Enzyme design. Structure first.
Site, PDB file in Angstrom:
ATOM      1  N   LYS A   1       0.830  -1.199   0.000  1.00  0.00           N
ATOM      2  CA  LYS A   1       0.000   0.000   0.000  1.00  0.00           C
ATOM      3  C   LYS A   1       0.869   1.255   0.000  1.00  0.00           C
ATOM      4  O   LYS A   1       0.543   2.245  -0.651  1.00  0.00           O
ATOM      5  CB  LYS A   1      -0.932   0.025   1.222  1.00  0.00           C
ATOM      6  CG  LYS A   1      -1.748  -1.250   1.472  1.00  0.00           C
ATOM      7  CD  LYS A   1      -2.831  -1.490   0.423  1.00  0.00           C
ATOM      8  CE  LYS A   1      -3.615  -2.764   0.734  1.00  0.00           C
ATOM      9  NZ  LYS A   1      -4.738  -3.026  -0.214  1.00  0.00           N
TER      10      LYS A   1
ATOM     11  N   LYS B   1      -7.544  11.151   3.616  1.00  0.00           N
ATOM     12  CA  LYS B   1      -8.901  11.663   3.486  1.00  0.00           C
ATOM     13  C   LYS B   1      -9.910  10.542   3.259  1.00  0.00           C
ATOM     14  O   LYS B   1      -9.742   9.720   2.358  1.00  0.00           O
ATOM     15  CB  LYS B   1      -8.974  12.670   2.336  1.00  0.00           C
ATOM     16  CG  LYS B   1     -10.217  13.545   2.364  1.00  0.00           C
ATOM     17  CD  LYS B   1      -9.939  14.924   1.786  1.00  0.00           C
ATOM     18  CE  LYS B   1     -11.027  15.916   2.157  1.00  0.00           C
ATOM     19  NZ  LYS B   1     -10.961  16.315   3.597  1.00  0.00           N
ATOM     20  N   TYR B   2     -10.954  10.506   4.083  1.00  0.00           N
ATOM     21  CA  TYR B   2     -12.063   9.591   3.847  1.00  0.00           C
ATOM     22  C   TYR B   2     -13.068  10.261   2.930  1.00  0.00           C
ATOM     23  O   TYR B   2     -13.649  11.290   3.274  1.00  0.00           O
ATOM     24  CB  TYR B   2     -12.752   9.183   5.151  1.00  0.00           C
ATOM     25  CG  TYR B   2     -14.012   8.361   4.938  1.00  0.00           C
ATOM     26  CD1 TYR B   2     -13.944   7.001   4.654  1.00  0.00           C
ATOM     27  CD2 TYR B   2     -15.270   8.946   5.018  1.00  0.00           C
ATOM     28  CE1 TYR B   2     -15.094   6.250   4.458  1.00  0.00           C
ATOM     29  CE2 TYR B   2     -16.421   8.203   4.824  1.00  0.00           C
ATOM     30  CZ  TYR B   2     -16.328   6.858   4.546  1.00  0.00           C
ATOM     31  OH  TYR B   2     -17.479   6.124   4.353  1.00  0.00           O
TER      32      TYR B   2
ATOM     33  N   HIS C   1     -17.423  -4.358  -0.438  1.00  0.00           N
ATOM     34  CA  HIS C   1     -16.223  -4.119  -1.229  1.00  0.00           C
ATOM     35  C   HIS C   1     -16.042  -5.170  -2.324  1.00  0.00           C
ATOM     36  O   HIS C   1     -14.974  -5.278  -2.921  1.00  0.00           O
ATOM     37  CB  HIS C   1     -14.993  -4.097  -0.320  1.00  0.00           C
ATOM     38  CG  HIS C   1     -15.170  -3.255   0.905  1.00  0.00           C
ATOM     39  ND1 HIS C   1     -15.158  -1.878   0.870  1.00  0.00           N
ATOM     40  CD2 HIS C   1     -15.377  -3.597   2.199  1.00  0.00           C
ATOM     41  CE1 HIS C   1     -15.343  -1.408   2.090  1.00  0.00           C
ATOM     42  NE2 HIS C   1     -15.480  -2.430   2.914  1.00  0.00           N
TER      43      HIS C   1
ATOM     44  N   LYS D   1     -17.330  -6.406  -5.963  1.00  0.00           N
ATOM     45  CA  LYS D   1     -18.036  -5.896  -7.138  1.00  0.00           C
ATOM     46  C   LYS D   1     -19.139  -6.842  -7.596  1.00  0.00           C
ATOM     47  O   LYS D   1     -18.987  -8.058  -7.535  1.00  0.00           O
ATOM     48  CB  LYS D   1     -17.050  -5.666  -8.288  1.00  0.00           C
ATOM     49  CG  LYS D   1     -16.010  -4.600  -7.994  1.00  0.00           C
ATOM     50  CD  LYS D   1     -14.846  -4.670  -8.972  1.00  0.00           C
ATOM     51  CE  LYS D   1     -13.785  -3.623  -8.667  1.00  0.00           C
ATOM     52  NZ  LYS D   1     -12.508  -3.915  -9.385  1.00  0.00           N
TER      53      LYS D   1
ATOM     54  N   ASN E   1      -4.064  -3.113  -9.601  1.00  0.00           N
ATOM     55  CA  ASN E   1      -4.154  -4.550  -9.753  1.00  0.00           C
ATOM     56  C   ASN E   1      -3.183  -4.938 -10.844  1.00  0.00           C
ATOM     57  O   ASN E   1      -3.348  -4.541 -11.994  1.00  0.00           O
ATOM     58  CB  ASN E   1      -5.574  -4.959 -10.138  1.00  0.00           C
ATOM     59  CG  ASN E   1      -6.615  -4.231  -9.325  1.00  0.00           C
ATOM     60  OD1 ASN E   1      -7.373  -3.420  -9.854  1.00  0.00           O
ATOM     61  ND2 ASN E   1      -6.639  -4.495  -8.025  1.00  0.00           N
TER      62      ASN E   1
ATOM     63  N   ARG F   1      -2.444  -7.413 -12.819  1.00  0.00           N
ATOM     64  CA  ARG F   1      -2.980  -8.659 -13.335  1.00  0.00           C
ATOM     65  C   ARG F   1      -4.190  -8.297 -14.157  1.00  0.00           C
ATOM     66  O   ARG F   1      -4.609  -7.140 -14.181  1.00  0.00           O
ATOM     67  CB  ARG F   1      -3.428  -9.563 -12.182  1.00  0.00           C
ATOM     68  CG  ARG F   1      -4.382  -8.873 -11.215  1.00  0.00           C
ATOM     69  CD  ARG F   1      -5.066  -9.844 -10.264  1.00  0.00           C
ATOM     70  NE  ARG F   1      -5.816  -9.147  -9.225  1.00  0.00           N
ATOM     71  CZ  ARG F   1      -7.072  -8.721  -9.350  1.00  0.00           C
ATOM     72  NH1 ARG F   1      -7.751  -8.919 -10.471  1.00  0.00           N
ATOM     73  NH2 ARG F   1      -7.651  -8.091  -8.339  1.00  0.00           N
TER      74      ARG F   1
ATOM     75  N   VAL G   1     -11.388  -9.449 -13.283  1.00  0.00           N
ATOM     76  CA  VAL G   1     -12.633 -10.136 -13.608  1.00  0.00           C
ATOM     77  C   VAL G   1     -13.395  -9.391 -14.689  1.00  0.00           C
ATOM     78  O   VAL G   1     -13.872  -9.989 -15.646  1.00  0.00           O
ATOM     79  CB  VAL G   1     -13.538 -10.244 -12.353  1.00  0.00           C
ATOM     80  CG1 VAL G   1     -14.924 -10.786 -12.711  1.00  0.00           C
ATOM     81  CG2 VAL G   1     -12.875 -11.102 -11.286  1.00  0.00           C
TER      82      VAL G   1
END
Lengths: 412, 412
Positions: free
Chosen positions: B116, B170-171, B204, B206, B258, B260, B263
């Site tokens: 992260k 920040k949220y 979270h 999809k 991501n 890779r 989906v």
């Protein structure tokens, strides 16, 4: 506008039409024979009406029953699909006289293009190129000609006697079947949607189709296409239609106009991005074609294999219960079919169970996708012609492209 | 080049990969658990190797068994799909150290974007916009922030103690999930393939994705896209990848890359005409991306519904035998699924059984095609989340477009 449509057909095209109606929020009426109660589109339709027993003559060709179906449901329009009554001008005239919209051309235009003779005359008048033809006529045309094919002149007289017991024209020995898709609306517009090559045939029955046609340049496409569009305007054409040509040594020769949607319309959809059945419905409702000629550009290549329930060698029909169906999918794979696992294919109608359509950025990609999709396809319980398709697709001449209308028969 | 690929995954993505391999003439090796002998792609593959018992830990996450599979078959490359080992840098490094091509980025780049922290630092260095963050820090950022979400300052200290038992940012209360697809090759090229909106989520996870993202102009697309492409070059990215953003009041904020395939890649395929898995394979073999940035133009709109074997209300899994499958088709309908009639969905892995993808000339058309396709879809024997999709598609806010990542949960 059109609020409720009677689908005067069956099988895959009835499903195709239902899907287009449902997209446009149009209510559907599925008319069906007693043998067709378990058809997918029937099970999906808003209203169903049984129009007669199994034989086509007593059901799908039953004009009074179909018109009565429109009346009792308060329908606005009738879509004839292909085959059956779709090019029956008496049907079209009765539909309009009864106050319903016939999703197709006007009866008069159907009749015009429904007579081998008047059709040619109208095309010749319109500048669409035709087969040379019509004592010394045969000479003018150049042998071989056809009344019985005649290859020599000493046999012309006798030949003419045989056949009479009544006109000539150039016999093209090894042409391709190339056809131009058109649309015309009630606002004076007519467009061409590239062409399709349907040369892979057995007994004049198409087996594999593709779009665009290999070898055909854009310049040639625009020439023949524009003549077809002009012709539409000249004859007052309305709806979807196809101009079919024999194509040999770089020349087009008109043979017939199908005044209806055709089985193989999906390959054109894939390369132009047009929904041809939705345009039929919109045009019938009185709207203009939803795009202009300049909006259309051929992109990529598409192929179609007609999957039939028949023995792949003898071609005898193979009716019966489909115990297992596994249909292919993935990128560039389209499956147009009413068949489902557990469905029984009846003997009463044609043998088509599905149309497998692939698309790719090149003809090579479309072909490989078709081969891979076929290999994934499982239809257990009945025989299909899948093995025939696999033979065609791996044929080196087919891979090269441009095989003539007698090729498949020569092969085999 | 790549002649034989081990498909180090299962289910629909394994089938997707197999289809791409078969198109390119690449031999396939399907590694599978004992529970997955009847997977469609396994039955289609050129070679099969059982790599362990049912649990993922002992099979699809079994690095030595998968690498051994590559060795004994003489494979050239391994495609990790998504999930499982696809973002495991130790796996990538072992694959390369063992002399095989890992179809993905280099291990070092995986690790970089797999932390992260280093990810953000690399993005900030590269000019990709990030979430503001890192005593008075919270003040600088502006509440609410997140260590435990903190909405006030008198609770900051205590909150920080709770969480420690270690950074802020920040949220965004009501953002959309918008992600940019990229490709980068070994020839120094990197392209962006528009974006996808995946805001319809539960926990979270999809549920529905679409492309392009509503509201996003081409100018904005080019700005954020070009920053993502540049970033690829800066970090030495290789293969397919996605930059995921939170999107709120017209601003993008990076959250994750991501490294890779994802989906939901098919919606991007439909609107750009790119085959993303084939590009993965070509790029891994050392070829350039098969097109330039100027070749890409968004056309139309595409949508994807993840069809899961689960209760549509409680979302508990629903493993078991699919007694009947009827999959939808027709124009603008794509079905990506390994499931077939008679197939038993196992308990050991995820709940996905199919991805239903639609495409149309407008978002409205794609949505209506999705609704109609869902209505034709029959999956009997197990429960699916099809009813949830039908609720989402008829939602007036979804129809308008632009619903945030908490919307689905608010709904329900």
């Amino acid at each position: 506008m059109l609020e409720k449509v009677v689908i005067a057909n069956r099988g895959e095209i009835a499903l195709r039409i239902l899907r287009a109606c449902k997209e446009l929020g149009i209510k559907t009426v599925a008319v069906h024979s007693t043998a067709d109660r378990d058809l997918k589109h029937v099970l999906l339709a808003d209203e169903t009406i049984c129009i007669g027993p199994a034989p086509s003559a007593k059901s799908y060709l039953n004009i009074p029953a179909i018109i009565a179906a429109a009346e009792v449901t308060g329908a606005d329009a009738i879509h004839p699909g292909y085959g059956f009554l779709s090019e029956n001008a008496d049907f079209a005239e009765q539909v309009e006289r009864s106050g319903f919209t016939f999703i197709g051309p006007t009866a008069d235009v159907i009749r015009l293009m429904g007579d081998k003779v008047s059709a040619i005359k109208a095309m010749k008048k319109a500048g669409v190129p035709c087969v040379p033809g019509s004592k010394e006529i045969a000479k003018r045309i150049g042998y071989p000609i056809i009344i019985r094919v005649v290859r020599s002149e000493d046999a012309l007289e006798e030949s003419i006697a045989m056949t009479k017991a009544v006109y000539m024209e150039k016999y093209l020995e090894n042409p391709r079947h190339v056809e131009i898709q058109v649309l015309a609306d009630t606002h004076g517009n007519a467009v061409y949607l590239a062409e399709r090559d349907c040369s892979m045939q057995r007994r004049h029955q198409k087996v594999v189709e593709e779009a665009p046609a290999p070898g055909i340049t854009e310049e040639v496409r625009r020439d023949i296409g524009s003549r077809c569009a002009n012709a539409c305007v000249e004859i007052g054409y309305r709806g979807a239609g196809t101009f079919e040509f024999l194509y040999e040594n770089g020349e087009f020769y008109f043979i017939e106009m199908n005044t209806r949607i055709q089985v193989e319309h999906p390959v054109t959809e894939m390369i132009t991005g047009v929904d041809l059945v939705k345009e039929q419905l919109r045009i019938a409702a009185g709207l203009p074609i939803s795009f202009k000629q300049e909006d259309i550009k051929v992109k990529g290549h598409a192929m179609e294999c007609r999957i039939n329930a028949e023995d792949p060698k003898t071609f005898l029909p193979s009716p019966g219960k489909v115990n297992h169906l596994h249909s292919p999918g993935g990128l560039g794979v389209r499956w147009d079919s009413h068949v489902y696992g557990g469905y029984t294919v009846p003997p009463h109608y044609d043998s088509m169970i599905a149309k497998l359509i692939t698309y790719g950025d090149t003809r090579e990609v479309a072909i490989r996708r078709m081969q891979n999709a076929l290999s994934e396809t499982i239809i257990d319980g009945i025989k299909t012609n899948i093995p025939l398709h696999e033979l065609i697709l791996e044929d080196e001449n087919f891979q090269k492209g441009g095989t003539n209308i007698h090729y498949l028969e020569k092969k085999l």
